[PDB]
Design a protein around this ligand. Structure first.
Ligand code: ZHE
Length: 513
């Protein structure tokens, strides 16, 4: 392990953050060491921030110009100058805390220059502030009230709902209420949004919404708008798939089957149309090694930064340098970026560690590793998940110390491919025995078996239905897990093919119900 003095000589990065966090959790950072430390942290968010702040709280930060404004309370705000009054009224909790006479007084004060404040002040003098704001069609006010409390729910007329998409908050609002199945009056109201007024993710979610109310023509129009506006080919393909499922225009399915993006929708479309499986690149570097240490986390952070900041030309230089067997994962990483994501790379590094598992199991391991890390042995996430299989430290230690009782086990063993694959196999055994489907296993790998069990216990998820199991896959309540399952499923199909153990993606979908 590295001392704080030695870590401080390394460039700021997630690897440095991780090792600082490890010192903090073992209580090895003194109050004196902690003084300058926030400048040594690459991403000052989450657990590392909570741990540091148990040693040195931050008071910060009130803009010096407005300090005096925060000396007032609800009881004294009428004594404050007008600038101070308007600053404090940015907070709806503050407004809620005022007495109603003062809300009336302030509403008058601000009616000319800040009618937004007037509307909220008067709204909070009623028993339903959302109703008052909705009657005023105050869009900024609507989103402030929603951020204040998700519990307000009301029917919204055609005029109002068509104004909501213009606000930056709309996409997260729509996603949240549709995926969580909350705010049913808002959800029902959003059936009347004109597809002309939305695009991209918003349009797509409104399609999903329309499907849940069996408004299939409205759903098609939303999905079509999404297909026309999405920036990424994978997302476009997802929208075209829905267009096809709803109306069965064979030109939509043909377009999907010819996609340059390899995803579950384009794979399924190819299978339905007897189109050949997409071309998978074959990487076999003849040079065996270079000088790069694939077990050094700091060396990876450095080369990753270079790769991500490299111009079209510099990528070609790095490609040649890492064109070795030993650095195959880095090579494929560079090529994927270098070819602007048009070629399909599905490598199988450190294969000797999995070759004795059955092919179906190999494919699942490889599918997870590809998405988790692109097979970078010293990969570290923002939550400090570790290695190719991106184990969280808690689970790594449980398996390594309690279950397998590996002598001198340290969580950093997860950076060794033999360990990552072995632990991955071990955990995948647990999950698969309970869940069976590789899609459900993927959801549980990323999101936990608890979340997955709760989702599968619901009456409305992964049961029989007109648009199942595809609709259920759009309604997986955690965005990261929803996305992850789709990507790992695609990878799984590809690796099964590469290992001469092909399965039809249609069989996967049948077994989800
Ligand atoms: C290294 C890293 O941050 N990996 C994360 C991963 O990042 C995306 C990877 C895609 C390939 C290139 C490396 C990052 O997202 C997963 C969820 O989808 C996480 O579980 C995983 O920890």
């Amino acid at each position: 392990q590295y001392s704080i003095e030695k870590l401080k000589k390394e460039e700021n990065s997630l690897a440095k953050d991780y090792y600082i966090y490890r010192l903090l959790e073992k209580n090895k950072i003194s109050k004196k060491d902690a003084q300058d430390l926030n400048s040594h942290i690459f991403r000052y968010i989450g657990k590392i921030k909570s741990e540091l702040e148990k040693i040195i709280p931050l008071k910060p930060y009130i803009n010096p110009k407005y300090a005096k404004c925060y000396t007032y309370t609800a009881n004294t705000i009428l004594d404050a100058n007008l600038t101070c009054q308007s600053v404090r009224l940015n907070s709806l909790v503050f407004i809620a805390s005022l007495n109603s006479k003062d809300r009336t007084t302030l509403a008058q004060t601000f009616k000319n220059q800040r009618p937004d404040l007037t509307n909220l002040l008067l709204a909070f003098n009623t028993s339903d502030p959302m109703s008052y704001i909705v009657q005023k069609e105050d869009i900024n006010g609507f989103f402030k009230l929603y951020n204040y409390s998700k519990k307000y729910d009301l029917d919204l007329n055609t005029s109002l709902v068509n104004k909501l998409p213009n606000h930056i908050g709309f996409k997260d609002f729509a996603q949240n209420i549709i995926i969580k199945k909350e705010n049913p009056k808002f959800r029902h109201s959003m059936l009347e949004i004109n597809p002309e007024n939305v695009s991209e993710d918003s349009a797509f979610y409104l399609g999903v919404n329309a499907l849940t109310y069996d408004k299939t023509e409205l759903a098609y129009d939303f999905f079509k708008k999404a297909a026309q506006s999405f920036k990424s080919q994978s997302n476009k393909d997802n929208a075209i798939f829905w267009m096809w499922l709803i109306k069965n225009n064979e030109e939509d399915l043909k377009t999907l089957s010819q996609s340059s993006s390899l995803n579950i929708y384009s794979l399924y479309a190819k299978e339905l149309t007897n189109t050949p499986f997409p071309k998978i690149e074959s990487l076999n570097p003849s040079k065996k090694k270079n000088n790069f240490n694939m077990q050094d986390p700091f060396a990876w952070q450095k080369i990753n930064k270079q790769i991500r900041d490299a111009n079209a030309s510099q990528l070609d230089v790095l490609a040649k340098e890492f064109d070795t067997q030993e650095t195959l994962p880095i090579y494929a990483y560079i090529l994927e970026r270098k070819n602007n994501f048009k070629k399909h790379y599905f490598i199988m590094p450190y294969y000797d560690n999995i070759k004795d598992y059955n092919k179906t199991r190999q494919a699942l391991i490889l599918a997870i590793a590809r998405q988790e890390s692109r097979f970078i042995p010293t990969a570290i996430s923002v939550s400090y998940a570790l290695g190719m299989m991106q184990f969280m430290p808690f689970l790594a230690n449980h398996i390594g110390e309690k279950e397998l009782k590996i002598p001198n086990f340290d969580q950093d063993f997860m950076f060794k491919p033999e360990i990552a694959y072995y632990f991955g196999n071990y955990h995948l055994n647990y999950l698969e025995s309970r869940l069976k489907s590789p899609l459900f296993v993927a959801y549980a790998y990323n999101g936990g078996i608890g979340f997955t069990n709760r989702m599968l216990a619901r009456n409305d998820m992964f049961k029989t239905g007109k648009f199942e199991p595809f609709l259920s896959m759009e309604l997986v309540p955690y965005q990261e897990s929803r996305i992850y399952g789709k990507k790992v499923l695609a990878n799984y199909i590809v690796y099964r093919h590469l290992l001469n153990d092909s399965i039809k993606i249609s069989d996967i979908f049948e077994n989800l119900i």
